[PDB]
Amino acid sequence: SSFSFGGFTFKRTSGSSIKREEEVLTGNLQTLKIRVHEGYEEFTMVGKRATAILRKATRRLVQLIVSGKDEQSIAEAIIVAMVFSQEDCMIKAVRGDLNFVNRANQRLNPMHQLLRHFQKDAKVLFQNWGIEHIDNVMGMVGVLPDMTPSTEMSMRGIRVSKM
Ligand SMILES: O=C(N[C@@H]1CCC[C@H](Nc2nc(-c3c(CO)[nH]c4ncc(F)cc34)ncc2F)C1)N1CCCC1
C-alpha cells in the first residue's frame, strides 16, 4: 500500500494501524476532526528533492532521518513528516490572527489544511516542536529550528543524513 502526501511518496516498511476519528484543539482552541492512525509504523518518504525514514507511533513521531538536495528541500520533508505524525504540538502550533481551518465544509481535509498552513510558515511549528541533546552519531547531524546544523542539539526526533 504505497500512497502520496505533500508531494512525497510514502511506503509502509513495518507495522500496522487502525483509524479513529478524533477531535483535537489547535493553539487557537479551535476544534478539528482528524482521522487518527493508531499503531507503531515505519515508512520511507520519497520526494523529488528529499528522502526520509520515518518512525511513528499514535500521534507521536519517534524518529525522522532526512536526506535532501539542500536546507529548503530538507525543511519541506520535515514539515510533511511533522504534519503526518498527527502530534499535539504540531496541532497546538496553529495559533493567532486568521489562523483558522475552514470547517463549514465537512468534506474538506484538515491534514491538507494543516500542511498548507505550515508550508507558508514553519517557524511556529519548528520552535514549538521541542529541542533535544543528541549523541555523537557520525554521518548524521542535528538540525536546530532555524535549519542550522548542530552536533550537540536538534529538533526532537530529527536527524539529517548526508546524500
Ligand atoms: O483523510 C484525508 N486525507 C489523508 C491525508 C494524509 C494521508 C492519508 N492517506 C493515507 N494514509 C495512510 C496512513 C497510514 C497507513 O499506514 N498511516 C498513517 N498515519 C498517519 C496518517 F496521517 C496517515 C496514515 N495510509 C494510506 C493512505 F492512503 C489521507 N482526507 C482526504 C479527503 C478526505 C479525507
UniProtKB/Swiss-Prot annotation:
Name its cellular compartments: Virion; Host nucleus; Host mitochondrion
Q: What does this protein do?
A: Plays an essential role in transcription initiation and cap-stealing mechanism, in which cellular capped pre-mRNAs are used to generate primers for viral transcription. Recognizes and binds the 7-methylguanosine-containing cap of the target pre-RNA which is subsequently cleaved after 10-13 nucleotides by the viral protein PA. Plays a role in the initiation of the viral genome replication and modulates the activity of the ribonucleoprotein (RNP) complex.
Q: How does it assemble?
A: Influenza RNA polymerase is composed of three subunits: PB1, PB2 and PA. Interacts (via N-terminus) with PB1 (via C-terminus). Interacts with nucleoprotein NP (via N-terminus). Interacts (via N-terminus) with host MAVS (via N-terminus); this interaction inhibits host innate immune response.
Q: Which family does it belong to?
A: Belongs to the influenza viruses PB2 family.
Q: What is this protein called?
A: Polymerase basic protein 2
**What gene name is given for the protein in this entry?**
PB2
Report where the shown chain sits in the full-length sequence: first residue, last residue, total length: 321 to 483 of 759
